[PDB]
């Protein structure tokens with residue numbers, strides 16, 4: 657299942673970096689033999705010592721499975737000192753860019769986005785993967801198309817579950833928390849937790865102290881607010897799972913509203929982000 661290469665540059669031409677890490681980089685790559693473009697995660701095997709066999713095991717499982725809302729693992733190359741995960745390149749744009757660019761945006765749009773995330777994350781959970789890093793930057797649109805699906809582009813402070821911050825043992829529930837936070841931002845354009853002093857901010861998250869403040873939340877449905885409250889629940893045992901969230905009427909039913917909330921959400925995204 658793994659292809660072997662003396663040197664990865666015999667296969668690909670590496671252009672821009674798409675993403676970095678202490679010991680991992682995702683690069684835009686052209687397959688020299690075909691012209692086709694991919695996102696290639698470059699991993700030093702030295703960074704895997706003590707886990708190489710087990711990581712390779714897991715990658716071998718995931719290579720055979722494509723989820724609609726997760727970038728596909730197209731191929732694995734192994735060179736003498738590196739592993740290369742050849743991934744589907746996504747061209748559709750970043751999540752917030754499209755929302756600010758759209759001229760029309762409703763709760764039903766936000767609900768459609770979260771439903772996709774729930775589906776992807778449920779699958780990852782079944783496979784034994786806790787993402788731990790779900791945030792808007794890891795969500796990319798497949799195409800520039802109007803009807804484009806959203807995709808998780810990559811998997812292994814303000815988005816992290818209280819039980820983590822409290823240095824406590826944690827589970828797949830941490831992802832359901834993050835999804836709640838993303839849904840919060842999708843409905844108002846600002847993060848639910850933020851402060852100057854990290855001591856304030858850490859405590860706000862620990863205590864799950866947030867509000868649906870006016871005027872931003874005034875035209876948002878009770879159903880959406882309830883949805884978010886069930887995911888941004890301090891107690892991971894009471895917190896909705898992905899499966900429970902996907903059954904909530906705001907997702908599964910018809911309670912998501914049809915009101916154009918673009919003007920306020922986009923103004924807040926512009927003002928709250930770089």
Ligand SMILES: Nc1nc2[nH]ccc2c2ccccc12
Pocket residue numbers: 674675682695727743744745746747796809810
């Ligand atoms: N356009 C992109 N496609 C990608 N497919 C898999 C990862 C990834 C990626 C990672 C960082 C930045 C951009 C992209």
